[PDB]
Write an enzyme that holds these catalytic residues in place. Structure first.
Site, PDB file in Angstrom:
ATOM      1  N   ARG A  44      51.766  40.518  -9.900  1.00  0.00           N
ATOM      2  CA  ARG A  44      51.877  39.109  -9.499  1.00  0.00           C
ATOM      3  C   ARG A  44      53.341  38.727  -9.505  1.00  0.00           C
ATOM      4  O   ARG A  44      53.819  38.046  -8.601  1.00  0.00           O
ATOM      5  CB  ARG A  44      51.019  38.066 -10.235  1.00  0.00           C
ATOM      6  CG  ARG A  44      49.534  38.173  -9.924  1.00  0.00           C
ATOM      7  CD  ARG A  44      48.634  37.492 -10.949  1.00  0.00           C
ATOM      8  NE  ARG A  44      47.458  36.923 -10.282  1.00  0.00           N
ATOM      9  CZ  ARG A  44      46.374  36.349 -10.856  1.00  0.00           C
ATOM     10  NH1 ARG A  44      46.226  36.221 -12.194  1.00  0.00           N
ATOM     11  NH2 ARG A  44      45.404  35.911 -10.036  1.00  0.00           N
ATOM     12  N   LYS A  67      51.263  29.903 -21.227  1.00  0.00           N
ATOM     13  CA  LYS A  67      51.378  31.342 -21.148  1.00  0.00           C
ATOM     14  C   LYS A  67      52.740  31.895 -21.630  1.00  0.00           C
ATOM     15  O   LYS A  67      53.807  31.418 -21.276  1.00  0.00           O
ATOM     16  CB  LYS A  67      50.814  31.888 -19.852  1.00  0.00           C
ATOM     17  CG  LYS A  67      51.229  33.312 -19.641  1.00  0.00           C
ATOM     18  CD  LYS A  67      50.548  33.957 -18.461  1.00  0.00           C
ATOM     19  CE  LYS A  67      50.625  35.470 -18.571  1.00  0.00           C
ATOM     20  NZ  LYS A  67      50.768  36.120 -17.273  1.00  0.00           N
ATOM     21  N   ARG A 127      39.364  23.542 -20.179  1.00  0.00           N
ATOM     22  CA  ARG A 127      38.604  22.673 -19.316  1.00  0.00           C
ATOM     23  C   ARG A 127      38.279  21.372 -20.020  1.00  0.00           C
ATOM     24  O   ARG A 127      38.111  21.335 -21.241  1.00  0.00           O
ATOM     25  CB  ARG A 127      37.348  23.384 -18.827  1.00  0.00           C
ATOM     26  CG  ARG A 127      36.134  23.090 -19.679  1.00  0.00           C
ATOM     27  CD  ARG A 127      34.993  22.480 -18.849  1.00  0.00           C
ATOM     28  NE  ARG A 127      33.832  22.091 -19.649  1.00  0.00           N
ATOM     29  CZ  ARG A 127      33.009  22.939 -20.281  1.00  0.00           C
ATOM     30  NH1 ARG A 127      33.151  24.260 -20.226  1.00  0.00           N
ATOM     31  NH2 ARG A 127      31.993  22.447 -20.983  1.00  0.00           N
TER      32      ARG A 127
HETATM   33  O1  BTN Z   1      53.470  39.559 -14.901  1.00  0.00           O
HETATM   34  C1  BTN Z   1      52.720  39.169 -15.887  1.00  0.00           C
HETATM   35  O2  BTN Z   1      52.908  38.137 -16.372  1.00  0.00           O
HETATM   36  C2  BTN Z   1      51.388  39.803 -16.212  1.00  0.00           C
HETATM   37  C3  BTN Z   1      51.315  40.890 -15.797  1.00  0.00           C
HETATM   38  C4  BTN Z   1      52.536  41.651 -16.658  1.00  0.00           C
HETATM   39  C5  BTN Z   1      53.250  42.582 -15.644  1.00  0.00           C
HETATM   40  C6  BTN Z   1      54.007  43.739 -16.460  1.00  0.00           C
HETATM   41  S1  BTN Z   1      55.681  43.291 -16.719  1.00  0.00           S
HETATM   42  C7  BTN Z   1      56.104  45.050 -17.215  1.00  0.00           C
HETATM   43  C8  BTN Z   1      55.240  45.957 -16.281  1.00  0.00           C
HETATM   44  N1  BTN Z   1      56.086  46.314 -15.176  1.00  0.00           N
HETATM   45  C9  BTN Z   1      55.598  45.787 -13.989  1.00  0.00           C
HETATM   46  O3  BTN Z   1      56.078  46.149 -12.895  1.00  0.00           O
HETATM   47  N2  BTN Z   1      54.601  44.935 -14.307  1.00  0.00           N
HETATM   48  C10 BTN Z   1      54.175  45.027 -15.589  1.00  0.00           C
END
Ligand code: BTN
EC number: 6.3.4.15
Length: 294
Positions: free
Chosen positions: A117, A175, A294
């Site tokens: 994400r 978060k 919620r």
């Molecule tokens: O991104 C986030 O908040 C949740 C998913 C965590 C992604 C982790 S960050 C370290 C690892 N390397 C990446 O390319 N993504 C994950």
């Protein structure tokens, strides 16, 4: 790619003081023009570098930097890669799959292509590899990951940190971190987490200023422990821990599985990590979805 200079660079600027290319160039051994060049990169990385003609250059505030030395210093064994600057921590390991061992790891404070994400050093990235003997995991797994992470954070002093079924850490209902698991078809998994150090909620922001080298170190340590514990006893040993850390436990949530919103009261997890949603006096487990206040 060789990113050494700007890092060396960033390193000097670290002390949140003012620095003139003349000053700098000395130490680095290069043209002020060369410097200007690198300065631009830091800038590219989202580094905050101010420039006062008369003055020189600086950072809005001193910063802390990863330091393998320090990291590996407090660590007993296992391969660990410190790459302040990188594409993605997960990818890096994904890429080396055949050369690793459960526990090997990779740490960064800047991801130029994160999977799943964010300015340099504003976050902490950690990824680990593990070979599960026996998918004797998945959901169990992510759970253990947040437990520990939340545990460690606590030790270093962030007490109100909580877990959110099944993969984020939460602070003041915001978060703070995010786990990401990736299976590879013995299971080969690559765990990856990102924490919000500084700047939806950050350690800084909540007055916590942990030593990144420390955190880094603790997690690796703690993680490998947890994982070996899990590897031979699964969830059981964590059930009570989950519960104490559960952010939503007993709270009213809204679970979104695919196209349907479902409401209910959270009653934690079962011995398998399934969430337990109580609806209309009924309690049943849910093996998937996305939890929400919620
Ligand atoms: O991104 C986030 O908040 C949740 C998913 C965590 C992604 C982790 S960050 C370290 C690892 N390397 C990446 O390319 N993504 C994950």
């Amino acid at each position: 790619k060789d990113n050494t200079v700007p890092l060396k660079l960033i390193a000097l600027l670290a002390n949140g003081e003012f620095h003139s290319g003349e000053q700098l160039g000395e130490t680095l051994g290069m043209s002020r023009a060369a410097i200007n060049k690198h300065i631009q990169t830091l800038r590219d990385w989202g580094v905050d570098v101010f420039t006062v003609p008369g003055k020189g250059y600086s950072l809005p505030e001193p910063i802390q930097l990863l330091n393998a030395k320090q990291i590996l210093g407090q660590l007993d064994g296992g391969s660990v890669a410190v790459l302040p600057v990188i594409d993605s921590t997960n990818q890096y390991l994904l890429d080396r799959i055949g050369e690793l061992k459960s526990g090997d790891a990779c740490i960064a404070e800047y991801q130029q292509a994160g999977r799943g994400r964010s300015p340099f050093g504003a976050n902490l990235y950690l990824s680990m590899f593990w070979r599960l003997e026996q998918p004797a995991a998945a959901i169990g797994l992510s759970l253990v990951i947040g437990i520990v992470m939340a545990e460690v954070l606590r030790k270093l002093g962030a007490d109100k940190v909580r877990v959110k079924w099944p993969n984020d850490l939460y602070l003041q209902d915001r978060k703070l971190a995010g786990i990401l698991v990736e299976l590879t078809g013995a299971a080969q998994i690559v765990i990856g987490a990102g924490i919000n150090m500084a700047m939806w909620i950050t350690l800084q922001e909540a007055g916590i200023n942990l030593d990144r080298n420390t955190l880094a170190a603790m997690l690796i340590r703690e993680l490998r422990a947890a994982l070996e514990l899990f590897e031979q006893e699964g969830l059981a040993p964590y059930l009570s821990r989950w519960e104490k850390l559960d952010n939503f436990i007993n709270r009213p949530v809204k679970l979104i599985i695919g196209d349907k919103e479902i409401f209910g009261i959270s009653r934690g997890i079962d011995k398998q990590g399934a969430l337990l949603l109580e609806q209309d006096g009924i309690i049943k487990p849910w093996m998937g979805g996305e939890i929400s206040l919620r």
